Amino acid sequence: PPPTEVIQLDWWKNCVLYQIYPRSFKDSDGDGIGDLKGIISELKHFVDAGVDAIWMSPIFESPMVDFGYDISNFYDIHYEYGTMEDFEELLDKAHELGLKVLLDFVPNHASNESEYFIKSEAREPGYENFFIWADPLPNPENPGVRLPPSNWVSQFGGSAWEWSEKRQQYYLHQFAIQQVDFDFRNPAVKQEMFNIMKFWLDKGADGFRLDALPYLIEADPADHEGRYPDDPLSGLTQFESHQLGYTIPLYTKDLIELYDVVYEWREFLDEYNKNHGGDTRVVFSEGYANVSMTMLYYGNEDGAIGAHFPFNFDFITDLSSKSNARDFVYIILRWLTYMPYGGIPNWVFGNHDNNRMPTRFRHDMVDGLNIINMLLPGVAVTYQGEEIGMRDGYVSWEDTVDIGDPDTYHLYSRDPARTPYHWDNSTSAGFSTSTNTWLPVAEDYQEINLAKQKETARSHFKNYQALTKLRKQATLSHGEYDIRALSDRTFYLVRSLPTHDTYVLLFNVSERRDTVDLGRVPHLTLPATVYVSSIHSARLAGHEITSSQLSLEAGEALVLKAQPI
Amino acid sequence: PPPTEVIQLDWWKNCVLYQIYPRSFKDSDGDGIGDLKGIISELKHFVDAGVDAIWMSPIFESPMVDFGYDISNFYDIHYEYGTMEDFEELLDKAHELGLKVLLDFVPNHASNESEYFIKSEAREPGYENFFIWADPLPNPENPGVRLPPSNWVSQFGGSAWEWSEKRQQYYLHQFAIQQVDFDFRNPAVKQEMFNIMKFWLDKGADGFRLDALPYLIEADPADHEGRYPDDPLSGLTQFESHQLGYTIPLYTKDLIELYDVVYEWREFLDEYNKNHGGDTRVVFSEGYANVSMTMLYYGNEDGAIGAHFPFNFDFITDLSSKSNARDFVYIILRWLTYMPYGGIPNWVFGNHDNNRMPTRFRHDMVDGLNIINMLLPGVAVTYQGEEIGMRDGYVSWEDTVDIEACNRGDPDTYHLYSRDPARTPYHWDNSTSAGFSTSTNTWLPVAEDYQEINLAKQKETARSHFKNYQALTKLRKQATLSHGEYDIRALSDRTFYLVRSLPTHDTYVLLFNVSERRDTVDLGRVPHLTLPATVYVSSIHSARLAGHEITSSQLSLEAGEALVLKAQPI
Ligand SMILES: [Ca+2]
Numbered sequence A: 001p002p003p004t005e006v007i008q009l010d011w012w013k014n015c016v017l018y019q020i021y022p023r024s025f026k027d028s029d030g031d032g033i034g035d036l037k038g039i040i041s042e043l044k045h046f047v048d049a050g051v052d053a054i055w056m057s058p059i060f061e062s063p064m065v066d067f068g069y070d071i072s073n074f075y076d077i078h079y080e081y082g083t084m085e086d087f088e089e090l091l092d093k094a095h096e097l098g099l100k101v102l103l104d105f106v107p108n109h110a111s112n113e114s115e116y117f118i119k120s121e122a123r124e125p126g127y128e129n130f131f132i133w134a135d136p137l138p139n140p141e142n143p144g145v146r147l148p149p150s151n152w153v154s155q156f157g158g159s160a161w162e163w164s165e166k167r168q169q170y171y172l173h174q175f176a177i178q179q180v181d182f183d184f185r186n187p188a189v190k191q192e193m194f195n196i197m198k199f200w201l202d203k204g205a206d207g208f209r210l211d212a213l214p215y216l217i218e219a220d221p222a223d224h225e226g227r228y229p230d231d232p233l234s235g236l237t238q239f240e241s242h243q244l245g246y247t248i249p250l251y252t253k254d255l256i257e258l259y260d261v262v263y264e265w266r267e268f269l270d271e272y273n274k275n276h277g278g279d280t281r282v283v284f285s286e287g288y289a290n291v292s293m294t295m296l297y298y299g300n301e302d303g304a305i306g307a308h309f310p311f312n313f314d315f316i317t318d319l320s321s322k323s324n325a326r327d328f329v330y331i332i333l334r335w336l337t338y339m340p341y342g343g344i345p346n347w348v349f350g351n352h353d354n355n356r357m358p359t360r361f362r363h364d365m366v367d368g369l370n371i372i373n374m375l376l377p378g379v380a381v382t383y384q385g386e387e388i389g390m391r392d393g394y395v396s397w398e399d400t401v402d403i404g405d406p407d408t409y410h411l412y413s414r415d416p417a418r419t420p421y422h423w424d425n426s427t428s429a430g431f432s433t434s435t436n437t438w439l440p441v442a443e444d445y446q447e448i449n450l451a452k453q454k455e456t457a458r459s460h461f462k463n464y465q466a467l468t469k470l471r472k473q474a475t476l477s478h479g480e481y482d483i484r485a486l487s488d489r490t491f492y493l494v495r496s497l498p499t500h501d502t503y504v505l506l507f508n509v510s511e512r513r514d515t516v517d518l519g520r521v522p523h524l525t526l527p528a529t530v531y532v533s534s535i536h537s538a539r540l541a542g543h544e545i546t547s548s549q550l551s552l553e554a555g556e557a558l559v560l561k562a563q564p565i
Numbered sequence B: 001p002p003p004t005e006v007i008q009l010d011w012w013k014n015c016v017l018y019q020i021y022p023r024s025f026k027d028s029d030g031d032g033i034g035d036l037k038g039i040i041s042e043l044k045h046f047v048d049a050g051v052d053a054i055w056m057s058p059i060f061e062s063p064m065v066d067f068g069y070d071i072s073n074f075y076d077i078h079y080e081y082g083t084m085e086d087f088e089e090l091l092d093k094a095h096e097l098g099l100k101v102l103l104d105f106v107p108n109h110a111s112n113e114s115e116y117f118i119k120s121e122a123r124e125p126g127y128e129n130f131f132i133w134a135d136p137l138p139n140p141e142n143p144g145v146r147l148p149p150s151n152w153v154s155q156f157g158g159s160a161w162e163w164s165e166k167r168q169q170y171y172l173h174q175f176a177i178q179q180v181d182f183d184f185r186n187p188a189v190k191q192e193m194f195n196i197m198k199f200w201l202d203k204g205a206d207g208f209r210l211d212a213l214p215y216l217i218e219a220d221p222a223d224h225e226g227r228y229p230d231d232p233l234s235g236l237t238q239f240e241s242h243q244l245g246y247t248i249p250l251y252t253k254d255l256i257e258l259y260d261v262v263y264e265w266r267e268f269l270d271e272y273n274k275n276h277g278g279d280t281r282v283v284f285s286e287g288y289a290n291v292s293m294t295m296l297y298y299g300n301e302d303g304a305i306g307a308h309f310p311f312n313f314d315f316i317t318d319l320s321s322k323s324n325a326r327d328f329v330y331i332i333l334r335w336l337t338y339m340p341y342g343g344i345p346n347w348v349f350g351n352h353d354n355n356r357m358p359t360r361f362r363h364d365m366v367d368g369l370n371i372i373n374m375l376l377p378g379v380a381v382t383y384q385g386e387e388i389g390m391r392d393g394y395v396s397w398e399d400t401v402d403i404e405a406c407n408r409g410d411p412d413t414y415h416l417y418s419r420d421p422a423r424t425p426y427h428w429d430n431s432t433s434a435g436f437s438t439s440t441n442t443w444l445p446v447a448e449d450y451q452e453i454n455l456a457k458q459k460e461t462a463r464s465h466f467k468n469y470q471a472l473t474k475l476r477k478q479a480t481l482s483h484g485e486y487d488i489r490a491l492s493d494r495t496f497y498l499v500r501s502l503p504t505h506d507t508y509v510l511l512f513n514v515s516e517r518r519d520t521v522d523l524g525r526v527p528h529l530t531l532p533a534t535v536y537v538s539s540i541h542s543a544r545l546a547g548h549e550i551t552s553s554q555l556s557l558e559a560g561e562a563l564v565l566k567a568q569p570i
């Protein structure tokens, strides 16, 4: 039978999406700080890797109190990364190479150094109600003691309420004292979010990653007898009143009203896309919430449509070095079971807030984990360095940028996952001409670097390239999936599609060898051909699997190419 | 192609297992108490239902403090239920009808009225260490102020330690004060469990349901500097020191040593089966525990073999009327994902310790839930009443006899704890006490809805829960259900499918709208389903009758509506 024809998917439905951490990608100007001209000089890497889309962690004007998540001007670039001109050059050169470029910002809050906040604190007309401003809770017992409006706890610990001496009122900060929560019931705030997005789309951005969406909306005092209602207490003895966990965020997180804002953002993008043509512009949402609240980002049963997808953090929250093959299967099945019909699945192993993939799992698992990301249906999300198996870097107390004491600092710091990218075995691993990098270069850069992996016959990077290339096959863009564990140690993932080749992942996620009966794997006729193997596998690409009995070493993964069903 | 032959499975791998609660099944003698002559009189019901095996809740000599789970003599029958002769007649008649009979074995504890306990408390030679006896915790603050050995909390509320004046020591009770925990590090106790099991297997029992196994073994004071270690505090402020939930049972539940006892029981039973021949005798284990601790009952990575299966309580613990179709799928997949290869799956929708299936779910979901039970691979477990969709009976504070409610509850809270509503007499018919008894004075009150919900009515009427139950047990004879693959996914938040398929054999498809709203689905999305297909079973409220042809790929299901479709072989 001739292979069936498939309808082309819109780019966002099956893109390889790469998270750039711009501070650590490429320093062009010898200051030891990654920058936009650096990213521009290495756009060819994305084409070479088979990446379709890049997003950058925030690069907007920022006092850098929360390392760029505290945005003071939503319409300009942070000077350390370059200029608006550099950003426009990045869009031009990326688009010339066929890449999509997404911007990351946080709708929930602005820097207290934003003009929005300066003007709002000063009660300037049109800005007075831009943020959540509240009087103290009346204290007729001790009128000399000022009470905050409610017991709400910041994500950073302490009160979510900060006193303004100038305004003689409290403002809400769900995050840092310097990150002020916008009032999303203010039409002027909703308009300003449309204005920010329109500005960047007009420059040519292909879409946005929007952070902290669960925190957008808090209880309306109108619904609680004119006061901000206390969050219910967790009743968990390990948390005091100043500690995150003391409260259940009933009135401060996952309010149904936040989804109406998201659906409004999707309506705005759909209208923008209709009125401009070219490549669909998208929003990918970030929110840590239960499965029900996560899936409401896609849309609802009443037919509302939201984010092109909410990010899937299940591999970060629910898989670990302790996970066995049955855990891998059951967690993979959660998104695929709960996602609404027609939703696009996405998969994430890493970001700048977590241990790097081989450090969080094991060094021998890098290839199998990259295969899972690339072979599951939908969108593969790669964190900078995963394509070469970068490990966490050693960072000393004295070299720490993410500052609590010299003995315990390593339990808190996210710096080890943010060390400069290993291009090669040149000075500072080719990240910089300078030895004075903003974080130290990991000690293993001479063993683990991109240039070496391109030179050597087998490598993480070559496996990454073979997998992004495989995603062009109809079986991966349009094929069904079947996933089950064969043992506590080994699971299979089968992509199949009538008249098209079958692709099978077999992955021993354990620390011991395992033998499995390939007769148990659906749609796998033998002999089959090894398409990809883990760098430590005895089997090379092109190796024939002929026996139904297969021994997999600890961490060993194979992708088999088998005849069509 | 001619249908392929399948190798017949051992009876226990795909049986329909029915839990009898003897006290509430059939009263033969007008005392308002179910009895063995009552069960004997309705053994034909199990044949009529398509039940392969019955397990009875305990029928051994008992003060009835925990309605039989407090056993004073493990070798004889509770007088209210009848005699050893009645039991022997029950086995004979059940076996003549081709039924298997399992007994409820309660190894964790004995009644404080057992000879074991009386002799142990008296320190008679060979019985001194039969139970967990402990000195008071030394009190260096105020010497001789009597402290319990540890903070351990009973499942029925209060301290797990009871002072004996006679012995001047505390004894352990994980359950009621009257249920005394055996010492499973004592070889004589382990020997006694083999003695009990051999006695009843020799009578001809087809096996045992094993009670409360997570609680068998607690921390050895030899590993904790000669004391019983405190369980970690939960740190949940809603629980004071006398309330269940105040502690995390780290030292009192799921100890790795308990599984070695289970594997020893299986070894004994395998040897018994080998030496005696006839039908395989089985053990099914009861334990509420996390997935890892539950799966260790089957066996371990080192090749130990335990229970033929541990009961799957997921439809009790993890699904309810709050659940959507995606929850149903994701929970059904948990057992099938985590069960060891070669394991037999089982499905439990109710028991005497939990609210009835239609009460936890909804009245309009009864058929869909029985279909899930019967159509999923492996063993279907039915609790007394599920085959006719019995609802929880009303039981006042005044009528409540459950020790757990009497101990943890008061006239306002008792409903949070009481198991009595799931223990109300079985609805045979519309006669006095729904035909459970000739007496109006029943040990628990008969549910108010017996005129509407009773077996006789469901056997007469054209469409009923019971007729649906019979059609589903019959369907389990098909190779597709005994040997077929499964595929399960949600079509929406409201509707899911379960497909049983087997090349050259008919394809069977459940479609179930678990929601309170109508749902329209595309049957083109269902694997191995070619139309037209035939309705084999429908919910009693479905517009479709058995024999209806499904021809359109757009299917609207009403709230709670379930269909089984019969479709051509793949
Ligand atoms: Ca907010």
Ligand SMILES: [Ca+2]
Residues within 6 Å of the ligand: B108, B174, B181, B182, B215, B216, B217, B218
């Ligand atoms: Ca015990």
Ligand SMILES: [Mg+2]
Residues within 6 Å of the ligand: A026, A027, A028, A029, A030, A031, A032, A033, A034, A035, A080
């Ligand atoms: Mg630079």
Ligand SMILES: [Mg+2]
Residues within 6 Å of the ligand: B026, B027, B028, B029, B030, B031, B032, B033, B034, B035, B080
């Ligand atoms: Mg009686």
Ligand SMILES: [Mg+2]
Residues within 6 Å of the ligand: A482, A522, B487, B527
């Ligand atoms: Mg299939």
